[PDB]
Design a protein around this ligand. Sequence first.
Ligand SMILES: Cc1cc2nc3c(=O)[nH]c(=O)nc-3n(C[C@H](O)[C@H](O)[C@H](O)COP(=O)(O)O)c2cc1C
Ligand SMILES: Cc1cc2nc3c(=O)[nH]c(=O)nc-3n(C[C@H](O)[C@H](O)[C@H](O)COP(=O)(O)O)c2cc1C
Lengths: 348, 348
Amino acid sequence: ALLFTPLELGGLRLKNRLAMSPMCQYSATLEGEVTDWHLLHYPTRALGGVGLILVEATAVEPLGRISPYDLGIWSEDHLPGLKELARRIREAGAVPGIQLAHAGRKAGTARPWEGGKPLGWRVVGPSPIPFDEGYPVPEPLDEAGMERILQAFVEGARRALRAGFQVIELHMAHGYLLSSFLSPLSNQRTDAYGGSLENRMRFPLQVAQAVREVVPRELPLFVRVSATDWGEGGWSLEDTLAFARRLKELGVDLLDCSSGGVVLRVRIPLAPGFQVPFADAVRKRVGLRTGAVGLITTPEQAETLLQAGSADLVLLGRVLLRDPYFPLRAAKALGVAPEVPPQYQRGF
Amino acid sequence: ALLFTPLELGGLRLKNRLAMSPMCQYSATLEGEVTDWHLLHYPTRALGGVGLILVEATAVEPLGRISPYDLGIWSEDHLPGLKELARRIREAGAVPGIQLAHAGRKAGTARPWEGGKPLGWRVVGPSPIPFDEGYPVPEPLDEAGMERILQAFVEGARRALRAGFQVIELHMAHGYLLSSFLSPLSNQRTDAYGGSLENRMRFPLQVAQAVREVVPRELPLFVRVSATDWGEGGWSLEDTLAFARRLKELGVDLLDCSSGGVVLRVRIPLAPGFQVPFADAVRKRVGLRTGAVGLITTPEQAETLLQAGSADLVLLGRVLLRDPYFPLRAAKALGVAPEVPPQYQRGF
Ligand SMILES: Cc1cc2nc3c(=O)[nH]c(=O)nc-3n(C[C@H](O)[C@H](O)[C@H](O)COP(=O)(O)O)c2cc1C
Ligand SMILES: Cc1cc2nc3c(=O)[nH]c(=O)nc-3n(C[C@H](O)[C@H](O)[C@H](O)COP(=O)(O)O)c2cc1C
């Protein structure tokens, strides 16, 4: 059972191949601090059996937030709450990781259950092109802006390591800041950071590199990407291949393969494992380890994409929101005896 | 779906008919205090959707414990811990209840996962008959001792109310103190508290009467009983019916119907729903509301026993240890849009 076989990354060993995918909770304080919500939400899924938890998008600057209730990491005062959250994650038996994020032209919307409407922030972008109707026109970054944000990512990693997180993921997916540099749908710059594939990769590759320099080799650096934006003439799987090789050269440990999010009006052919092809290709054609994600909900299905070499790691989101103990019960279903809290032995 | 229709009990309205059955976690301090374990374990199940959480057997007197890490309620110093627990359960959307307990002749054994051996306490009971081989001979209570234990239950129940608990269950099941007074495999006293059925019910009814007096009518008092002991000549369903009638006269709101526990060398015909005929008999022949429990694992099963009139309340134990969010996912399986935390809406 490969799902429940340990997985070496950097100098770690994940006790299994299930990870909790990052999922925004919109439940931080207004100054972006960890609250009781997270201290219950994450250790629950850790008792639940995943080997790795990736804490939701965590803004590396106040204007990089999605919502006013996002986790932040732009401040030393975020350290105590973050350090407490990684500690309860480890104590409930998983490796604590965290996704560092900047929301670019999609920054500044209400929580989704409070309407999810733009708030009117000075959001920033590659090109002065609104995400969709009703959204602000991002102002396009000059080079000093880019360098400020790269530092914010670099200092956010340093701060996450000090908080005791052992796996950092760089969010470069879903139409947020770095993803929007990648795609020509959102990026129409005519300087060195737009136009060609190489140019559109430039800034995101500078960020990975500068973050990689401050994360020692023992701790894995993930990058999440939208493997395609699903748009006519948009970013494609082939582009993703090119971007993958450059990440591998820089020493990124694992590409976490999502898709979409750059613009709205595109056809997304959603289905169980619809993004699994993207993990499989990168892994087999570039030789960079991949995380698969997207409508993975069943133990036989996670096992199978593993057996097939489509990925190294299986990431779960939604199934864990409604069934946080999925992984303990999944093992049994694959004929593996689950390691469960002694308290709970008589439930298995 | 009856399973998701409210239930009025006393002055309060349970939001659905599912309840977390009481389950020892053996995770308190040596002095019996709430710890971080409980403050994670219980609210997880509250978020997971039960209307009622019944906190595990909580001993009204130190020698009344099963393990040395049982919750206690014999001291005011228990109050801030118990209060924080009831608070967090309520804040996660369930009504907090607690089972008041005294382990009797089965008192003082090690944690299950540490061997569960007797530990040599001066355990007490109705008669000097060990539970099984290996176990101390209990000291027979005198009137004074019975009065002392009666008053610990009373102060127990008073303390629980001041902590914010809104349902109190009396543990008279499972071979523990009050259950050993009911069964003639454990009660062979020759005074007013043994011999005849009337005598054998005598102490247990006095406790139920004394607790009922300090628990406002607005707030439901439950009693758990072992509806049979499964022993030749032992406590029987017919006995349970007569006990139930008396409990009902005293103003007990609901009978929680379990079985077994008194002695070890009996055969229990385990099957899904096996204790359901006990709840069904009491409820239809006595008119006392009942809670059904025992290998209930499935929304359709839980709904069907309610449709049948077999019980008013469905208690879940082990399925909630392995699947704490069962009830949210059970509403949907039953055609009901679950109320789930806004954070989790997209998982459903
Ligand atoms: C409520 C919610 C919040 C999410 N937040 C993030 C996020 O913080 N960063 C990210 O890369 N993806 C985020 N996602 C996407 C999930 O991580 C996951 O990639 C996606 O839901 C597909 O996996 P699934 O079908 O297993 O849920 C979020 C998804 C949901 C439903
Ligand atoms: C670990 C564990 C602890 C238990 N603790 C108690 C207890 O505190 N009080 C009680 O009356 N029964 C207790 N029981 C029995 C359960 O509450 C329940 O009646 C029984 O397990 C059958 O229901 P189930 O099949 O849904 O688990 C416990 C059972 C287990 C599994």
